[PDB]
Paper text:
[name] is highly expressed during anaerobic growth in the presence of nitrate, and plays a central role in nitrate uptake, while NarU has important functions during severe nutrient starvation or slow growth. In this work, we demonstrate that [name] is a nitrate/nitrite antiporter, using an in vitro reconstituted system. The overall structures of [name] in both the occluded and inward-open states adopt a canonical MFS-fold with 12 TM helices, with TM1–TM6 and TM7–TM12 forming the N and C bundles, respectively. The substrate-binding site is located at the interface between the N and C bundles, in the middle of the TM segment.
Each asymmetric unit of Crystals I and II contained one inward-open molecule, while in the asymmetric unit of Crystal III, there were two occluded molecules (Mol A and B). In the nitrate-bound occluded structure, we observed a strong electron-density peak in the substrate-binding site. The crystallization conditions for the occluded-state crystals (Crystal III) contained ammonium nitrate. Therefore, we assigned this peak as a nitrate ion. The nitrate ion is sandwiched between F147 and F267, and forms a π–π stacking interaction with the π electrons of their phenyl groups. In Site A, two oxygen atoms of the nitrate ion form a bidentate salt bridge with the NH1 and NH2 atoms of the R89 guanidinium group. In Site B, two oxygen atoms of the nitrate ion form a bifurcated hydrogen bond with the phenol hydroxyl group of Y263 in TM7. In layer C3, part of the N-terminal loop consisting of P20 and E21 forms van der Waals contacts with the cytosolic terminus of TM11, including D392, E393 and M396. These interactions between the N and C bundles tightly close the pathway to the cytoplasmic side to prevent the intrusion of water or other solvent molecules into the substrate-binding site. In each of three independent simulations starting from the occluded state with the bound nitrate, no large structural change in the overall conformation was observed during the 250-ns simulation, suggesting that the overall structure of the occluded state is stable in the lipid bilayer environment. In the nitrate-bound occluded state, the negative charge of the nitrate in the substrate-binding site relaxes the electrostatic repulsion between the two positively charged arginine residues (R89 and R305), thereby enabling these two arginine residues to be in close proximity in the low-dielectric intramembrane environment.
Residue numbers in the entry: 11 to 242, 252 to 457
The structure:
Amino acid sequence: TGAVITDWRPEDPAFWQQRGQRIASRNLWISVPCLLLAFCVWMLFSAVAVNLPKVGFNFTTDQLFMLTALPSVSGALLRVPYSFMVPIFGGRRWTAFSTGILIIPCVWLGFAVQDTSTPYSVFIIISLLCGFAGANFASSMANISFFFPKQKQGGALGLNGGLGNMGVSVMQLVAPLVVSLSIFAVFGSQGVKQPDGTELYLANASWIWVPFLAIFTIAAWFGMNDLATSKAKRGHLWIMSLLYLATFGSFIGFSAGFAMLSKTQFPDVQILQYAFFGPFIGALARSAGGALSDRLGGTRVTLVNFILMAIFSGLLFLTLPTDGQGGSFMAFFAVFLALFLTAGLGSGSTFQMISVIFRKLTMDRVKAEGGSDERAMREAATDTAAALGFISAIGAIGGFFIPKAFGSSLALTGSPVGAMKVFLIFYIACVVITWAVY
Ligand SMILES: CCCCCCCC/C=C\CCCCCCCC(=O)OC[C@H](O)CO
Ligand SMILES: CCCCCCCC/C=C\CCCCCCCC(=O)O
């Protein structure tokens, strides 16, 4: 029952009832909180950048948007490499490592926000380091696919990735709470007197994850396992890439720059009180998207969803001050909730299609070729790990594009309309292209 498992036989019904299920279950429920904490670290600047002017920093609006968009750059670049790391180092060893190193940017960001002389380029580095957390998805999903290789075990991936995405809302909920409280005075936390008369501890938004990162690094080390087992069309790979970019990329893109966008359009509103609700119902709808796609088919769900994305991205224009005249935060917030909801739905819907193409179809193609059940699970798991690594990497681009588009549109034109036009054309194009592959 040691950490390294040399006897792994999922092709044996007896092994699974005796050893297999209990092992795979233990790994999943340590993988989920580790992945959840990664999504907390990944999107940290979505909440931190908003509070940066409140503590003395004078970065431009575009600079603040850039800080929220950059972790999706290093995240996208590292997801394909991360997808190959579990077979090399083992699920347990890599999970402990990929979670443990996330302590460094968290500690650093806490000290950076307490010094107003901290260069913007330092925040750039920290922002890029937070992107390492975003790459944890590809490794975490790859790991689960090996622990749950059987045909009926499809869903352990959706659960791991679904609960992982919850980390965005968790962080956007926890961060505004802890910054009002003084809890790390022992470690050198300094408060900044707000115009409200209250105190603001921006370091807490980052330092709060350090103990939890430490705990589940130890938990992954003593609780997870290393599978000592062998782990050996492109047209579909690009369609899924485009689909996952339009859906998940929208989800993670809106999650990164919503609070910043809301702050530029409605300065009076403390958006961090409600911002977490967006990614929350988005990650929640992700689970509904998979079952909906399985029932109604990937084509019908993707088509209708993209229609709604275009419509809701179109309604977003009506909720904006034009210029300094009118506008409705309530409508602005509600429409974005509709955009978060439809992005998460399509995210889970697209993900369900990925597993159908690269896991189930693969596992059944080898069987039809007379292949064993062991080889069936193996190829399906590795092909899924490799595909999802590529697909999620392309999908992460939206996490950079959307906030950067807003910042560029606001700087060049003094309005977010320019970025929203591009989004609308994109969604309309997605409707057309999805209708092309039909
Ligand atoms: C906090 C600064 C950044 C930290 C970056 C960490 C780098 C990740 C490398 C290994 C992770 C697992 C480390 C092992 C976890 C501790 C295990 C331990 O406490 O003891 C093990 C026992 O002695 C023997 O079985
Ligand atoms: C396989 C691709 C791996 C990508 C690794 C991404 C991690 C990069 C981390 C930071 C490196 C420093 C970036 C340079 C900052 C420039 C600051 C500036 O120009 O203003």
